[PDB]
């Protein structure tokens, strides 16, 4: 019967919740009480990239920490050179409605997608020197919200159809499909080892997925509204979520609990992007307050603010070497903060 | 450097194309269309000339782009903000929905649901300033439907004859009672005129009005 399984199912949530309390020995805030603070983090706009004629939704750094990508509703995908602020490529999109970007780890490929329900992959290194579109991954039924390359052939995408998928670019078919989210999936983050990835959905939950098996290992709750951004800790043993509850939370994968909440009474708008520092000591979160805060990731003390944007800070990414932090916004400008 | 210099030559040749095409594109007119499945958006688009379907037609040297977002079947909360700043919001409702009901809900009138969508859209925080063109289609069909069937069925409080004129009127103002931003947005309602297809000329005229009112901002009238 439905009630047999339901009265059963609500019990299974109890042992999960019962065991999590038993493993809640002491709060990270108590353990990190005597750590010396990070001090005022004064970070200034070094470079400002101009050339977008609409609001920016997505940006992604390169693995060489110098090039980066950005997409906007103007239907242009631009590859920047952050050092010399000069445009390397300006890719016209078939669909002006683009909500995500990814720059391949090898830098041979770039991918974008949005309301067109397609993940388009553009080839950068092309004999005829004109970025050409390679493949169009059309297997989703809702807007694509995120996409992250594993290799030049594997890309994992999260969509508004409550499902994530792992693709094979050569064949253009979903190698694996991740199901179990009861709300629209907003963002995903890959583990450093590229064996696991966590996804945040509109159902106020984050799920840890396994890329090979295709089954969800753990599910984290605690937020009150949509989860809009997610990133792993550098060591791949923790991750942070940005929600519309104007709180950032640091979850652990081994302890399977929540550690911190980064909430401030002053802040009432929703978090749009989150990202870490190379050491994992700073958690940069791009709010709707038009500004971007920098949190002490082990003290939960707002040490630093990056207020330079007219409109909301849509995307926010840090370099692999951690020498810079770049924030996009709806004001059509990318700013490199160092 | 020799290299760096040639580089930035490209970067400016990029920027020339950007601005240029940005201005070719900014010249186009962007209408967002919404509605119920049977609103007859399909029949409107037919009159005017996957996922988000885009439609292109020109009228009196004006280019129109229509973003039929009918099928997204996802949380509108997350993707509507993308269309903020479309010139106007064409909204189609079929007048023939007063006696119906969705096959999914028990007895919630299709018309009462049409209002709720409009309610949430005319009162959407992202379109505080946007004008709303309201096409009310299916007028003839409403005429026949009303000629036999009462309107009290849908509006229990209705003081008026089943005369098409009076009947429609109530509704029109009824839809226009949804907006809280009374002189913040202007609702230009038209009744679908099948044959003349001046459905489009109404649009031409509707568009200009909103544009003209907006120009009174850009013209430095302040």
């Amino acid at each position, epitope marked *: 019967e439905l009630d047999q399984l339901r009265q059963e199912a609500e019990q299974l949530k109890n042992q999960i919740r019962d065991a999590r309390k038993a493993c809640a020995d002491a709060t990270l805030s108590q353990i990190t009480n005597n750590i010396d603070p990070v001090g005022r983090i004064q970070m200034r706009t070094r470079r400002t990239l101009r050339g977008h004629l609409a609001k920016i939704y997505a940006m992604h750094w390169g693995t060489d920490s*110098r*090039l980066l990508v950005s997409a906007s509703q103007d239907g242009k995908l631009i590859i920047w*050179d952050s050092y*010399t602020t*000069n445009k*390397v*490529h300006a890719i016209p999109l078939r669909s002006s409605w683009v909500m995500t970007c990814a720059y391949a780890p090898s830098g041979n490929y770039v991918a974008c997608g949005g309301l067109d329900n397609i993940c388009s992959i553009y080839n950068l*290194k092309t*004999r*005829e*020197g*004109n970025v050409r579109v390679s493949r169009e991954l059309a297997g989703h039924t809702g807007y694509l919200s995120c996409c992250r390359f594993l290799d030049d052939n594997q890309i994992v995408t999260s969509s508004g159809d409550t499902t994530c998928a792992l693709w094979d670019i050569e064949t253009g078919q979903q190698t694996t499909t991740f199901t179990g989210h009861t709300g629209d999936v907003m963002s995903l983050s890959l583990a450093p080892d590229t064996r696991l990835f966590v996804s945040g959905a509109c159902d106020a939950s984050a799920k840890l997925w396994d890329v090979r098996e295709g089954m969800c290992r753990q599910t984290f709750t605690g937020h009150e509204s949509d989860i809009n951004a997610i990133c792993f800790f550098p060591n791949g043993n923790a991750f942070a979520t940005g929600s519309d509850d104007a709180t950032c939370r640091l979850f652990d994968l081994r302890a399977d609990q929540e550690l911190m909440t980064y909430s401030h009474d002053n802040i009432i708008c929703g978090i749009t992007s989150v990202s870490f520092s190379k050491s994992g000591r700073l958690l940069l979160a791009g709010y709707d307050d038009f500004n971007c805060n920098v949190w002490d990731a082990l003290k939960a003390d707002r040490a630093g603010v990056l207020a330079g944007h007219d409109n909301r800070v849509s995307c926010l990414g840090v370099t692999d070497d951690g020498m810079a932090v770049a924030t996009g916004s709806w004001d059509s400008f990318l700013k490199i903060w160092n | *450097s*020799a*290299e*760096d210099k*040639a*580089a930035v*030559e*490209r970067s400016k*040749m990029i920027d020339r194309n950007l601005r240029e095409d940005g201005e070719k594109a900014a010249r186009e007119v962007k209408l967002l269309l919404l509605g119920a499945g049977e609103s007859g958006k399909s029949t409107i688009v037919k009159q005017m000339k996957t996922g988000i379907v885009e439609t292109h037609f020109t009228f009196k040297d004006l280019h129109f782009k229509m973003f039929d977002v009918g099928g997204q079947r996802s949380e509108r909360k997350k993707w509507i903000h993308c269309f903020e700043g479309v010139t106007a919001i064409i909204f189609c409702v079929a007048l023939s929905d007063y006696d119906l009901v969705l096959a999914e809900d028990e007895e919630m009138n299709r018309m009462h649901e049409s209002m709720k969508l409009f309610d949430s859209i005319c009162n959407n925080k992202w379109f505080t300033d946007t004008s709303i063109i309201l096409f009310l289609n299916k007028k003839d069909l409403f005429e026949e439907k009303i000629k036999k069937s009462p309107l009290t069925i849908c509006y229990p409080e209705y003081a008026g004859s089943n005369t098409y004129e009076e009947a429609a009127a109530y509704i029109q103002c009824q839809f226009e009672d949804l907006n809280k931003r009374k002189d913040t947005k202007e609702i230009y309602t038209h009744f679908t005129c099948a044959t003349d297809t001046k459905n489009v000329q109404f649009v031409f005229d509707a568009v200009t009005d909103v544009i003209i009112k907006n120009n009174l901002k850009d013209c430095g009238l302040f």
Partner: single-chain antibody
Amino acid sequence: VQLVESGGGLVQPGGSRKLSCSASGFAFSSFGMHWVRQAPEKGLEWVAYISSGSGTIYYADTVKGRFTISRDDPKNTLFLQMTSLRSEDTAMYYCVRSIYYYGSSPFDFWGQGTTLTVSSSDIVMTQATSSVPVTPGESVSISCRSSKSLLHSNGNTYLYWFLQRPGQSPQLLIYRMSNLASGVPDRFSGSGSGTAFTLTISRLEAEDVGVYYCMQHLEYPLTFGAGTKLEL
């Protein structure tokens, strides 16, 4: 992606002839083109250059004010207008394409060039090795020397390498020091700093025997070096 040029042949001195290079199979409108001439017995020598969209036109010392270079983007052609040819303009005129953006490979593709026989503050690159004997399966190193520090401020040593097999157009091997061109085996490698440069081949074959060239790109007019022919 082939490039073919038209013209050349036999011209009396003082005559004005035109060279047309019809690009085919690539985005010609976004490629900075060059012209490079090779004397019948001597090495390469840069002559002209046009940027993308005819924004920047440069020339060599020997052809300044004597040559006019133009491009026709819609027809995918490149033109060279030569005026009052001298006896020292007898050379094979290759046409080279190059695109300049972060990480690009300029001078990657070379035309077949045309034969032209007239009737009758500059960096100098020096390599004093010619007709060096070598056997297949051995390791050979080719050394180059500059008169100026090619290592720019940003760390880019704008030194290039080329390989001209007998009876073929020159082919890029190394577009900057410690970099490897597209479609060239891993055997070729180059390590150097400032004014000292080397090209190391681990194991060679009958296919890569020929003459090698060194070019700098720190500043115009892109002076080349003398040849370095591998003997086999």
